[PDB]
Design an enzyme around this catalytic site. Structure first.
Site, short mmCIF file in Angstrom:
data_model
loop_
_atom_site.label_atom_id
_atom_site.label_comp_id
_atom_site.label_asym_id
_atom_site.label_seq_id
_atom_site.Cartn_x
_atom_site.Cartn_y
_atom_site.Cartn_z
N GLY A 1 -6.59 0.94 1.24
CA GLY A 1 -7.23 2.23 1.19
C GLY A 1 -7.63 2.44 -0.25
O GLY A 1 -6.95 1.97 -1.18
N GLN B 1 -9.73 7.62 -7.36
CA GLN B 1 -9.09 6.44 -7.97
C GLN B 1 -10.03 5.61 -8.81
O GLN B 1 -9.59 4.76 -9.57
CB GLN B 1 -8.47 5.54 -6.94
C1 LIG Z 1 -0.01 3.54 2.51
C2 LIG Z 1 -0.87 2.47 1.87
C3 LIG Z 1 -0.04 1.19 1.77
C4 LIG Z 1 -1.49 3.14 0.62
C5 LIG Z 1 -0.81 2.87 -0.67
O1 LIG Z 1 0.42 2.73 -0.65
N1 LIG Z 1 -1.50 2.88 -1.85
C6 LIG Z 1 -2.85 3.05 -1.97
S1 LIG Z 1 -3.56 3.04 -3.45
N2 LIG Z 1 -3.56 3.23 -0.83
C7 LIG Z 1 -2.97 3.24 0.40
O2 LIG Z 1 -3.69 3.44 1.39
#
Ligand SMILES: CC(C)C1C(=O)NC(=S)NC1=O
Ligand SMILES: CC(C)C1C(=O)NC(=S)NC1=O
Lengths: 162, 162
Positions: free
Chosen positions: A46, A51
């Site tokens: 994700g 970000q």
């Molecule tokens: C829940 C998934 C593993 C999650 C994460 O832990 N960290 C980022 S940056 N994105 C995500 O979707």
């Protein structure tokens, strides 16, 4: 074009992102392209627009259970019950680290695909957790503030907890 | 002899350390030697024995305000008032990161120098914070569990908060 992922402590991860208002446009397509690309380069499941220091209600997610590859603008989330589930979460704004975070096991999310078509889904488990996690980014929340058990918080290569 | 500093997520940082019972001994002197040495190599102001995976109520601290170089066994702490003070803390079990942590501005601590002589001091501000922080290590507590404001938690090289 791959983008620099900003790290925890950056003031820009703490903002509340405005809505996307250019659905269907070339700029938006280019930006989501970058997002999928940036997400793949850093091995993410994700990636939220803040970000990469883009102040927008936008997120990409998915991988080949499976979570369909999805780009989602103006997300809104609704829990579908009260059941919480613990699971491991890390951040690509927080590399080398992870904790166990409780999240709703069951949600619906609604918003728009980048071309303007509406997207509404029920999701559960990992799928749901991903979307809740990215959603947090859009309102300037990060996972550490959601840790109930600090014994589980630590570095990836070291961590020993169930 | 420099020792590996273990990182957050290591189960061994979560233990409650037993008391030191070899005051005045060569083994204890050798261990504290290592501690000062390990603390200096990693540029620390404080180092707790569990941070090098030695299960003992022992800590070293200090630097040339100033905090006298101190090795302290079987520490016990007493707050001297209720005034809290916020300040930056990081960990050498947690490198690259820091938050703002509230701590008692005023304490007394008691224990033993490695040769057996009793040590009791009033300390305040930074001196007090160092000792509270290392003390946490002896009871298996780490600073993230003490963060009240998560906007201040992030990486050293990035962080922008007052
Ligand atoms: C829940 C998934 C593993 C999650 C994460 O832990 N960290 C980022 S940056 N994105 C995500 O979707
Ligand atoms: C408070 C002080 C700066 C402190 C710290 O933040 N981290 C370690 S590992 N020891 C310390 O004494």
């Amino acid at each position: 074009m791959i983008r620099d992922i900003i790290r925890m402590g950056d003031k820009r991860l703490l903002r509340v992102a405005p809505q996307v208002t250019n659905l269907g446009s070339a700029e938006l397509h280019a930006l989501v392209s970058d997002m999928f690309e940036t997400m793949g380069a850093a091995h993410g499941v994700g990636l939220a627009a803040p970000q990469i220091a883009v102040d927008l209600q936008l997120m990409v997610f998915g991988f080949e259970p499976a979570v369909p590859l999805t780009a989602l603008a103006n997300a809104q989330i609704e829990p579908l019950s009260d059941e919480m589930e613990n699971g491991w979460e890390g951040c690509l704004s927080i590399p080398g680290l992870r904790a166990v975070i409780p999240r709703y096991r069951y949600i619906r999310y609604r918003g728009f695909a980048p071309d303007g078509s509406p997207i509404e889904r029920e999701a559960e488990g990992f799928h749901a957790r991903v979307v809740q996690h990215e959603y947090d980014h859009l309102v300037g929340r990060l996972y550490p503030s959601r840790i109930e058990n600090f014994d589980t918080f630590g570095f990836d290569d070291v961590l020993s907890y169930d």
